[PDB]
């Protein structure tokens, strides 16, 4: 298991616009394509994205180019936030994974804003972590995915993912 199957399973993958569970336009693997309200927003950003006239549908080639760019993006994203960088540091390579998949969907500024989690996770206080990860909006809203990113994070394995 790697991280690319890791986000793979939690996010699924979609070849035609769609909306994401806050009601936000989204293409292939959980790339958010706009927050606005109009497909026709939505339509462009993706022709934008893709370098194509896509008429909101693309091919599995062109979804795991977007879905590789934003794996490193959350990953260089998280390496140049200095809130977020010490706390990758201090990880082994498993958790390591659950903070680029927090990353991946609620963006840098939104993982910044666990102060607390992040640091019981640098601390190493696995149990505590994950009790306080729990209530947050992202819990309440996604209980299942939050559930098995927040399992990674108390055990260190992939166990909630096999
Ligand atoms: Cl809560
Ligand atoms: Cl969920």
Known sequence: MNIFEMLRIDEGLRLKIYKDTEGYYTIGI???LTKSPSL?????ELDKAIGRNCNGVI???EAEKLFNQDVDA???GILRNAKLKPVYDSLDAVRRCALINMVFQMGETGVAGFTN?????QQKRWDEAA???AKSRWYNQTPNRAKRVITTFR????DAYK
Not at 40 to 44: G, L, P, R, T, Y
Not at 117 to 121: A, D, G
């Open 59 to 61: 091919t599995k080639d």
């Open 155 to 158: 055990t260190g394995t992939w």
């Open 117 to 121: 989690s992040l640091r019981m996770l």
């Open 131 to 133: 009790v306080n990860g």
């Open 40 to 44: 026709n927003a939505a339509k462009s």
């Open 74 to 76: 959350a990953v260089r």
């Open 30 to 32: 959980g790339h958010l």
